[PDB]
Design a binder for this molecule. Structure first.
Ligand SMILES: NC(=O)C1=CN([C@@H]2O[C@H](COP(=O)(O)OP(=O)(O)OC[C@H]3O[C@@H](n4cnc5c(N)ncnc54)[C@H](OP(=O)(O)O)[C@@H]3O)[C@@H](O)[C@H]2O)C=CC1
Ligand code: SF4
Ligand code: SF4
Ligand code: SF4
Lengths: 208, 156, 176, 80, 291, 114
């Protein structure tokens, strides 16, 4: 098990375990899960109410700074009543440790202007709103970034296909750029590479 | 047919004049812009040919589309293309631009710049070699050698 | 270890301030920059004449998309569809009838040079090394009709040279 | 000069000048929504049309609670 | 019949429609917009150009990938015409210039060209040969242009008699002749270009309307001088042979149907003049309607 | 179960906000259609605007109508600025036929259109 295998270092696993237990004790109110993966980054799964108290606590408090903000995407899965996941990502400048604050939501429940507590989150919030439609409440200015203006449909959803519905060209009748229903020249031959026999027996879900 | 001989040499003169200078504008969105500014480098001079980079669209000669043309880009593209003088010639550089290519199956990619402007010279590559782009400019110049505009105006 | 920049002030010695003021009032280091660019004026220029001297390459350059064949033999492709299975832009279109003499073959083997991103995943994936990237990069096509290759275009492209690809595969049966 | 009957008259002929009501079919105590066939979309059109012609600021709850031409002129007379 | 002449799916931009149109000339105005409606239909335009590659370049990406095809032709030979119409479904004849040249004039183009191409088209097996003509082109005087097109109508009725003779009115569009003639300085009914070319494509794709000649009507039909009033109210090569052609004849011909019998809705002059009349600087809509 | 509401409390403030939004689109059309110099009468533009309001009339929820208020608000802001060019404003219409009537037989001639 030793050569050509990325080694674990369970001392960091224990330290982040103690920190996660510390967090679950000091904020009893909005904690459902504090999980630690074997490659040792913290994940904290959160009810969508106290996200602003969580961020105002974990920006500060002098036991865990976490000034550093990173990615936010509300990674869309079906099959749950709450489809979307706000995935905040944080790094402390002083401590070299990465935590992930994942709170859940569905297609209509917002968060409540998290830009006021992290100033980097402005175009991140506007981006997630434009690409998905996850409305973010009481934000100062929502617009559209990374789409066309006349385009609509919130394309990073699963229901939006690989191509779109509009397609542009230049017509010479009215001498301008117009749109059409999309008309491919090749199929996009979709492959079913879901070959059976369970390459990972560690994650076997139970049946009925 | 001394008039026709004068027409032949005069057509030769103006076609030589058109193919000689050819100062373009670099449209240049993505990494094919980096490749254009690498074929303006010391190891491949456009300036051996008199082909000089110039960001002035009111005096551009060949418009080189290069990069991933999008829906959000395209009205600005043809607004650039309209206010270009009537001698205009189009080089589509890169697999993004000459048929969509790698980002073919998505929203917000016009499947090549054929749907926006007419195209004279397709040159492929992702990225093309700078040396290959220079060769594409040479074959465009041979197209400019083959114009017979003044002959067609003489016998129209 | 941190080796940081600009923690120093111009000291107020009289010679320091008159040398900095001479830099100001007499443009001296500006003229030093002039001397630098004249030192690059008198160099020999590092250009190459293109249409008579083509630029250097490697034996491992990725080019042309030719089909090869056996030594005085049949088509080295088998229509086993791996090149479409790993072609990322999916420019490979394969339809495979078996021929008359029982052996398995093709009908249609197409590349879109518009779509191909020139990785050589098909080069790393063809189990018999049939489709091989060529050496040269000269298409410059006037039409959007011509940039959709068919099987006879690819086989004529493989007919246009072998000894090049012979030397390249002899240079690359050892690493790849 | 700016008196009640002239305000009534000018509201009257701009209702005449509005074209989507066919016929004229004139009634001042009309409740013209149900009886004269007007949707509330046309209602907000007419109320802010008066606002555009010579009206006051005319907020939206006052724009809904009138529904009636004599009552509209009585709202203008409630301010003007 | 053989396959691929059946259409498939929707229409336009690799949505294959079932007609193959060999279009003559078309590097000018009306043939260009007709090519645009065929590419919007998603058809195969076989166009011969006899010109520099640059003008057919500026009309080139109108159709889809390879659905267009370009080839040389001339108004003197025959082998190039037969090489053009090797494998054609339909063919439309639109060629003619409003001014005389050194080598080619009004005569022998309208007298030579439809004879030969109608002959080889009748030989090579086409259907729906659609030939254009001017409105009210007769043997009436002071109009070499109108009498040559009338002789052309007689010849198209002569050889391949099952041909669609069409007669549109004085067209106005984006690149109009006489409106732009007014920009640089007796009723009349002009009709806009997309009404005409929609009528053409509907008459070419709606069979049982074949062999019977068709006429187009401008939906105003008022005086020339009121139109000059309107065009200068909105806007703030000069040979008078053209001015006899635009002063001479303007009438209806009820001997044959028109727009609404074909399946095409008209558009009047005013809205389209608001479209095309730009260039105020760097609305007075009169329309007095004489009969 | 319950839902955090977005902006409104019942359908009434939703109708009030959409009313006001339609007033805003009404005062948005003529100045902008002069400024971009399109080719469409003010009657035709306004009537297709109120047609677009007629398109989504049957929605029975306060949340979705609030979200459409947000949609129309953003689109109205970026049309009242000069960002969305002539292409997109004309793209609101349909100048690409699409003439297809809902006749069973006319859909039956060129077929596979159930
Ligand atoms: N009032 C009018 O004049 C109206 C005219 N029409 C018809 O529309 C058709 C198209 O004309 P339009 O769009 O106005 O513009 P054009 O006059 O430019 O179109 C005529 C076409 O035929 C070509 N052509 C002309 N003479 C010759 C020749 N001798 N040999 C070969 N080709 C020739 C032209 O030039 P090139 O080959 O260089 O491209 C052009 O492509 C004409 O046939 C005309 O009868 C229809 C309605 C109204
Ligand atoms: S063709 Fe390839 S190299 Fe060129 S812009 Fe596209 S991704 Fe970049
Ligand atoms: S991987 Fe090679 S042998 Fe297999 S189908 Fe492709 S070219 Fe043919
Ligand atoms: S080089 Fe890449 S894109 Fe081109 S055919 Fe091979 S795998 Fe496909």
């Amino acid at each position: 098990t030793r050569p050509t295998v990325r080694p674990r270092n369970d001392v960091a696993h224990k330290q982040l375990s103690a920190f996660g237990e510390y967090v679950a004790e000091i904020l009893p109110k909005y904690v459902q899960q504090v999980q630690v993966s074997c490659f040792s980054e913290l994940e904290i799964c959160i009810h969508p109410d106290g996200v602003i108290p969580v961020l105002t606590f974990l920006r500060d408090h002098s036991n865990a700074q976490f000034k550093s903000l990173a990615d936010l995407t509300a990674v869309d899965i079906p099959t749950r009543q709450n489809r979307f996941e706000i995935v905040y990502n944080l790094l402390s400048l002083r401590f070299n440790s990465r935590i992930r604050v994942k709170t859940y939501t569905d297609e209509l429940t917002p968060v409540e202007s998290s830009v006021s507590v992290y100033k980097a989150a402005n175009w991140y919030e506007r981006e997630i709103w434009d690409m998905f439609g996850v409305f973010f409440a009481n934000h100062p200015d929502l617009r559209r970034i990374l789409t066309d203006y006349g385009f609509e449909g919130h394309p990073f959803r699963k229901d939006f296909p690989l191509s779109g519905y509009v397609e542009l060209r230049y017509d010479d009748e009215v001498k301008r750029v117009v749109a059409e229903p999309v008309e491919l020249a090749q199929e996009f031959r979709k492959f079913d590479l879901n070959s059976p026999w369970e390459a990972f027996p560690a994650y076997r879900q139970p049946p009925e | 047919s001394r008039g026709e001989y004068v027409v032949a040499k005069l057509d030769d003169l103006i076609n030589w004049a058109r193919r000689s200078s050819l100062w373009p504008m670099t449209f240049g969105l993505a990494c094919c812009a980096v490749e254009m500014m690498h074929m303006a480098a010391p190891r491949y001079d456009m300036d051996r040919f008199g082909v000089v980079f110039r960001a002035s669209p009111r005096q551009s000669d060949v418009m080189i589309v290069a990069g991933t043309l999008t829906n959000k880009m395209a009205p600005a593209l043809r607004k650039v293309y309209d206010q270009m003088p009537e001698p205009r010639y189009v080089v589509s550089m890169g697999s993004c631009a000459n048929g969509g290519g790698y980002y073919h199956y998505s929203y917000s990619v016009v499947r090549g710049c054929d749907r926006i402007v007419p195209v004279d010279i397709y040159v492929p590559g992702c990225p093309p070699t700078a040396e290959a782009l220079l060769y594409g400019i040479l074959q465009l110049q041979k197209k400019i050698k083959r114009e017979k505009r003044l002959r067609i105006w003489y016998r129209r | 270890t941190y080796k940081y920049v600009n923690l120093r002030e111009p000291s107020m010695d009289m010679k320091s301030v008159t040398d900095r003021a001479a830099q100001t009032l007499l443009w001296t280091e500006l003229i030093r920059g002039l001397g630098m660019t004249l030192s690059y004026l008198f160099r020999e220029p590092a250009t190459i004449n293109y249409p008579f001297e083509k630029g250097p390459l490697s034996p491992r350059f990725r080019g042309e998309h030719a089909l090869r064949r056996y030594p005085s033999g049949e088509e080295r492709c088998i229509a086993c569809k791996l090149c479409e299975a790993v072609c990322p832009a999916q420019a490979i279109t394969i339809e495979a009838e078996p021929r008359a003499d029982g052996s398995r073959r093709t009908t249609r083997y197409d590349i879109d040079m518009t779509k191909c991103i020139y990785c050589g995943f098909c080069q790393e994936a063809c189990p018999v090394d049939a489709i091989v990237e060529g050496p040269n990069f000269e298409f410059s096509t006037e039409t959007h009709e011509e940039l959709l290759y068919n099987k006879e275009k690819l086989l004529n492209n493989g007919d246009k040279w072998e000894a090049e690809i012979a030397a390249n595969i002899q240079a690359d049966y050892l690493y790849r | 000069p700016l008196t009640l009957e002239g305000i009534k008259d000018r509201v009257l002929y701009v209702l005449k000048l509005y074209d989507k009501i066919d016929p004229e079919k004139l009634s001042v105590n009309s409740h013209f929504m149900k009886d004269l066939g007007l949707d509330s979309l046309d209602q907000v059109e007419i109320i802010m049309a008066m606002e555009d012609e010579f009206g006051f600021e005319i907020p939206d709850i006052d724009a809904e609670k009138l529904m009636c031409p004599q009552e509209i002129v009585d709202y203008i007379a409630d301010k003007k | 019949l053989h396959h691929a002449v059946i259409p498939h799916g929707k229409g336009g931009r690799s949505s294959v429609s079932g007609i193959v149109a060999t279009v003559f000339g078309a590097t000018g105005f009306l043939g260009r917009y007709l090519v645009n409606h065929l590419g919007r239909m998603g058809s195969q335009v076989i166009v011969p150009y006899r010109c520099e590659p640059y003008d057919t370049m500026h009309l080139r990406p109108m159709g889809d990938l390879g659905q267009i095809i370009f080839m040389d032709w001339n108004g003197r030979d025959k082998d190039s015409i037969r090489r053009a119409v090797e494998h054609s479904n339909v063919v439309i004849n639109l060629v003619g210039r409003e001014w005389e040249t050194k080598n080619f004039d009004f005569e022998d183009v309208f007298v030579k060209i439809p004879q030969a191409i109608a002959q080889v088209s009748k030989e090579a097996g086409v259907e729906k040969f659609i030939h254009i003509s001017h409105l009210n082109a007769d043997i009436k005087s002071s109009s070499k242009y109108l009498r040559n097109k009338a002789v052309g109508e007689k010849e198209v009725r002569e050889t391949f008699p099952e041909a669609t003779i069409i007669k549109p009115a004085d067209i106005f569009g984006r690149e109009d002749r006489f409106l732009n003639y007014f920009a640089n300085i007796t009723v009349k009914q002009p009709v806009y270009i997309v009404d005409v070319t929609k009528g053409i494509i509907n008459a070419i794709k709606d069979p049982d309307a074949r062999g019977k000649t068709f006429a187009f009507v401008g939906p105003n039909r008022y005086l020339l001088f009121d139109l000059v009033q309107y065009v200068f109210a909105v806007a703030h090569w000069t040979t008078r042979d053209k001015v006899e052609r635009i002063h001479t004849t303007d009438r209806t011909l009820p001997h044959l149907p028109g727009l609404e019998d074909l399946g095409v809705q008209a558009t009047p002059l005013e809205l389209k003049a608001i479209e095309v009349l730009r260039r105020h600087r760097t609305s007075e809509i009169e329309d007095v309607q004489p009969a | 179960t319950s839902v955090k509401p977005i902006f409104s409390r019942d359908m009434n403030e939703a109708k009030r906000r959409v009313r006001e939004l339609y007033r805003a689109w009404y005062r948005e059309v003529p100045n902008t259609v002069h400024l971009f110099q399109l080719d469409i009468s003010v009657k035709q533009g306004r009537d297709k605007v109120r047609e677009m309001f007629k398109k989504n009339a049957h929605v029975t929820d306060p949340r979705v109508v609030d979200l459409l208020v947000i949609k129309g608000k953003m689109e109205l802001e970026e049309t009242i600025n000069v960002w969305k060019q002539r292409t997109h404003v004309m793209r609101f219409f349909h100048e690409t036929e699409a003439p297809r009537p809902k006749d069973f037989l006319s859909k039956f001639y060129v077929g596979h259109d159930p």
